[PDB]
Scaffold this active site. Structure first.
Site, PDB file in Angstrom:
ATOM      1  N   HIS A  40       0.828  -1.428  -0.144  1.00  0.00           N
ATOM      2  CA  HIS A  40      -0.010  -0.124  -0.070  1.00  0.00           C
ATOM      3  C   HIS A  40       0.663   1.272  -0.163  1.00  0.00           C
ATOM      4  O   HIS A  40       0.377   2.403   0.036  1.00  0.00           O
ATOM      5  CB  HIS A  40      -1.364  -0.040   1.046  1.00  0.00           C
ATOM      6  CG  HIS A  40      -0.467   0.256   2.629  1.00  0.00           C
ATOM      7  ND1 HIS A  40      -0.404  -0.463   3.434  1.00  0.00           N
ATOM      8  CD2 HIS A  40      -0.435   1.665   2.857  1.00  0.00           C
ATOM      9  CE1 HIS A  40       0.037   0.344   4.603  1.00  0.00           C
ATOM     10  NE2 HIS A  40      -0.135   1.625   4.335  1.00  0.00           N
ATOM     11  N   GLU A  52      19.268   6.901   8.391  1.00  0.00           N
ATOM     12  CA  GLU A  52      18.678   8.100   8.937  1.00  0.00           C
ATOM     13  C   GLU A  52      18.448   7.979  10.325  1.00  0.00           C
ATOM     14  O   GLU A  52      18.004   7.255  11.024  1.00  0.00           O
ATOM     15  CB  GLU A  52      17.231   8.298   8.261  1.00  0.00           C
ATOM     16  CG  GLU A  52      17.065   8.372   6.973  1.00  0.00           C
ATOM     17  CD  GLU A  52      17.218  10.032   6.371  1.00  0.00           C
ATOM     18  OE1 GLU A  52      17.934  10.627   7.145  1.00  0.00           O
ATOM     19  OE2 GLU A  52      16.476  10.093   5.185  1.00  0.00           O
ATOM     20  N   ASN A  54      17.189  11.790  12.640  1.00  0.00           N
ATOM     21  CA  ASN A  54      16.272  12.880  12.146  1.00  0.00           C
ATOM     22  C   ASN A  54      16.169  12.819  10.693  1.00  0.00           C
ATOM     23  O   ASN A  54      17.112  13.167   9.921  1.00  0.00           O
ATOM     24  CB  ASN A  54      16.732  14.044  12.707  1.00  0.00           C
ATOM     25  CG  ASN A  54      15.623  15.079  12.692  1.00  0.00           C
ATOM     26  OD1 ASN A  54      14.749  15.355  11.722  1.00  0.00           O
ATOM     27  ND2 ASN A  54      15.403  15.884  13.670  1.00  0.00           N
ATOM     28  N   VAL A  57      17.359  16.327   8.630  1.00  0.00           N
ATOM     29  CA  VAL A  57      18.764  16.818   8.960  1.00  0.00           C
ATOM     30  C   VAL A  57      19.668  15.780   8.259  1.00  0.00           C
ATOM     31  O   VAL A  57      19.285  14.380   8.457  1.00  0.00           O
ATOM     32  CB  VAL A  57      19.051  16.836  10.329  1.00  0.00           C
ATOM     33  CG1 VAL A  57      20.143  17.546  10.706  1.00  0.00           C
ATOM     34  CG2 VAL A  57      17.830  17.908  11.285  1.00  0.00           C
ATOM     35  N   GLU A  62      23.875   9.031   6.362  1.00  0.00           N
ATOM     36  CA  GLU A  62      22.883   8.531   5.511  1.00  0.00           C
ATOM     37  C   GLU A  62      23.395   8.337   3.965  1.00  0.00           C
ATOM     38  O   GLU A  62      24.424   8.689   3.645  1.00  0.00           O
ATOM     39  CB  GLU A  62      21.962   9.939   5.145  1.00  0.00           C
ATOM     40  CG  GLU A  62      21.370  10.707   6.254  1.00  0.00           C
ATOM     41  CD  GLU A  62      21.984  11.459   7.146  1.00  0.00           C
ATOM     42  OE1 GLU A  62      23.093  11.744   6.797  1.00  0.00           O
ATOM     43  OE2 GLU A  62      21.714  12.043   8.258  1.00  0.00           O
ATOM     44  N   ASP A  84      -0.164  -7.405   1.848  1.00  0.00           N
ATOM     45  CA  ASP A  84       0.301  -6.174   1.713  1.00  0.00           C
ATOM     46  C   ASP A  84       1.898  -6.224   1.842  1.00  0.00           C
ATOM     47  O   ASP A  84       2.412  -5.837   3.155  1.00  0.00           O
ATOM     48  CB  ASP A  84      -0.209  -5.406   2.865  1.00  0.00           C
ATOM     49  CG  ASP A  84      -0.052  -3.762   2.604  1.00  0.00           C
ATOM     50  OD1 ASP A  84       0.511  -3.447   1.726  1.00  0.00           O
ATOM     51  OD2 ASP A  84      -0.440  -3.118   3.841  1.00  0.00           O
ATOM     52  N   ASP A 171       1.261   1.530  19.983  1.00  0.00           N
ATOM     53  CA  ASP A 171       0.738   0.925  18.560  1.00  0.00           C
ATOM     54  C   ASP A 171       1.482   1.607  17.483  1.00  0.00           C
ATOM     55  O   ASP A 171       2.095   2.697  17.837  1.00  0.00           O
ATOM     56  CB  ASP A 171      -0.723   1.389  18.318  1.00  0.00           C
ATOM     57  CG  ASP A 171      -1.259   0.483  17.237  1.00  0.00           C
ATOM     58  OD1 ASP A 171      -0.891  -0.507  16.694  1.00  0.00           O
ATOM     59  OD2 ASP A 171      -2.329   0.633  16.870  1.00  0.00           O
ATOM     60  N   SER A 172       1.731   1.177  16.516  1.00  0.00           N
ATOM     61  CA  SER A 172       2.169   1.767  15.217  1.00  0.00           C
ATOM     62  C   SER A 172       0.935   2.775  14.653  1.00  0.00           C
ATOM     63  O   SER A 172       0.121   2.794  15.239  1.00  0.00           O
ATOM     64  CB  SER A 172       2.675   0.767  14.070  1.00  0.00           C
ATOM     65  OG  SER A 172       1.978  -0.075  13.858  1.00  0.00           O
ATOM     66  N   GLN A 174       0.119   6.169  11.361  1.00  0.00           N
ATOM     67  CA  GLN A 174       0.178   6.602  10.105  1.00  0.00           C
ATOM     68  C   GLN A 174       1.744   7.116   9.939  1.00  0.00           C
ATOM     69  O   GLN A 174       2.198   7.662  10.866  1.00  0.00           O
ATOM     70  CB  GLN A 174      -0.515   7.862  10.057  1.00  0.00           C
ATOM     71  CG  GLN A 174      -2.142   7.788  10.074  1.00  0.00           C
ATOM     72  CD  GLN A 174      -2.548   8.426  11.539  1.00  0.00           C
ATOM     73  OE1 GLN A 174      -2.183   9.577  11.760  1.00  0.00           O
ATOM     74  NE2 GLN A 174      -3.398   7.728  12.193  1.00  0.00           N
ATOM     75  N   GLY A 175       2.090   6.854   8.840  1.00  0.00           N
ATOM     76  CA  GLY A 175       3.701   7.001   8.531  1.00  0.00           C
ATOM     77  C   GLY A 175       4.665   6.110   8.852  1.00  0.00           C
ATOM     78  O   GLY A 175       5.719   6.042   8.507  1.00  0.00           O
ATOM     79  N   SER A 177       3.718   2.724   8.223  1.00  0.00           N
ATOM     80  CA  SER A 177       3.537   1.759   7.111  1.00  0.00           C
ATOM     81  C   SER A 177       4.755   1.249   6.462  1.00  0.00           C
ATOM     82  O   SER A 177       5.440   2.339   5.979  1.00  0.00           O
ATOM     83  CB  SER A 177       2.348   2.375   6.411  1.00  0.00           C
ATOM     84  OG  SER A 177       1.020   2.243   6.850  1.00  0.00           O
ATOM     85  N   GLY A 178       4.823   0.199   6.286  1.00  0.00           N
ATOM     86  CA  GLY A 178       5.914  -0.402   5.436  1.00  0.00           C
ATOM     87  C   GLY A 178       7.083  -0.979   6.336  1.00  0.00           C
ATOM     88  O   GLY A 178       7.832  -1.391   5.774  1.00  0.00           O
TER      89      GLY A 178
HETATM   90  N1  LIG Z   1      -2.979   1.142  14.073  1.00  0.00           N
HETATM   91  C1  LIG Z   1      -1.972   0.666  13.198  1.00  0.00           C
HETATM   92  N2  LIG Z   1      -1.123  -0.023  13.798  1.00  0.00           N
HETATM   93  N3  LIG Z   1      -1.718   1.424  11.953  1.00  0.00           N
HETATM   94  C2  LIG Z   1      -2.937   2.073  11.381  1.00  0.00           C
HETATM   95  C3  LIG Z   1      -2.326   3.306  10.693  1.00  0.00           C
HETATM   96  C4  LIG Z   1      -1.265   2.869   9.613  1.00  0.00           C
HETATM   97  C5  LIG Z   1      -0.397   1.925  10.412  1.00  0.00           C
HETATM   98  C6  LIG Z   1      -0.711   0.652  11.119  1.00  0.00           C
END
Ligand SMILES: NC(=[NH2+])N1CCCCC1
Length: 223
Positions: A40, A52, A54, A57, A62, A84, A171-172, A174-175, A177-178
């Site tokens: 995605h 990386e 920061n 910067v 890098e 995914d 949790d993880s 937005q941003g 991902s991957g």
């Molecule tokens: N809640 C999560 N772990 N997320 C949702 C936002 C994107 C990454 C995975």
């Protein structure tokens, strides 16, 4: 990452930032020329950024290397997020060192209860938005398939697992991902999806990397 800690500069040496004018996803370096990320995250014009700390910067460790090709899993479904996973090839090999290093693929699938390290430059807030610029880390356990399915009725496939905390708070997001989920020194997961971030009874959902080892190896061997 919500509820995590500052990793420390270059302490997660396989963590990459994918940049298309700005950071948009994480990834994991799996050899000198290939990165694993989430399907995605696919787009045109990817530059892989290694070493990386920061991401705003240039600090001195890098390596910025444009992608020559990317390969989304043939069975990726963007509606269900099944499969995914994608591979990204670097135009030139990275120079590997203690701060830019590959992560091994798994020999076996990791079990519920195993502790893992999840990392990324994503949002640190469950309500609202704040991006941290330095890498954040979270230690979290894999959850049982039963708990995962009960949290997300109708949505968990055999290519997904949940990790985190049903109570919320960690949790993880937005941003992220991957990016990587590493357990006992092997890449077991890819940050994939979840409902909001760090919400009660809505743990993170991760691509189950052990199901893809043959595809990864065969794809690398011919591309
Ligand atoms: N809640 C999560 N772990 N997320 C949702 C936002 C994107 C990454 C995975």
């Amino acid at each position: 990452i919500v509820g995590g800690y500052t990793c420390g500069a270059n302490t997660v040496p396989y963590q990459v930032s994918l940049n298309s004018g700005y950071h948009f996803c994480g990834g994991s370096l799996i050899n000198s020329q290939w990165v694993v990320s989430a399907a995605h995250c696919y787009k045109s014009g990817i530059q892989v950024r290694l070493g990386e700390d920061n991401i705003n910067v240039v600090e001195g460790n890098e390596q910025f290397i444009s992608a020559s090709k990317s390969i989304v899993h043939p069975s990726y479904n963007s509606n269900t997020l099944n499969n995914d996973i994608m591979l990204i090839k670097l135009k030139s090999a990275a120079s590997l060192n203690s701060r830019v290093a590959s992560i091994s693929l798994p020999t076996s699938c990791a079990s519920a209860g195993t502790q893992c390290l999840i990392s990324g430059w994503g949002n640190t807030k469950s309500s609202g938005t704040s991006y941290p610029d330095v890498l954040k880390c979270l230690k979290a356990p894999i959850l049982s398939d039963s708990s995962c399915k009960s949290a997300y009725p109708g949505q968990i496939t055999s290519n997904m697992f949940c990790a985190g905390y049903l109570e919320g708070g960690k949790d993880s997001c937005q941003g992220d991902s991957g990016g990587p989920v590493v357990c006992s020194g092997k890449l077991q997961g890819i940050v994939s999806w979840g409902s909001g971030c760090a919400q009660k009874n809505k743990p993170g959902v991760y691509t189950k990397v052990c199901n893809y080892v043959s595809w990864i190896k065969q794809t690398i061997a011919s591309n």
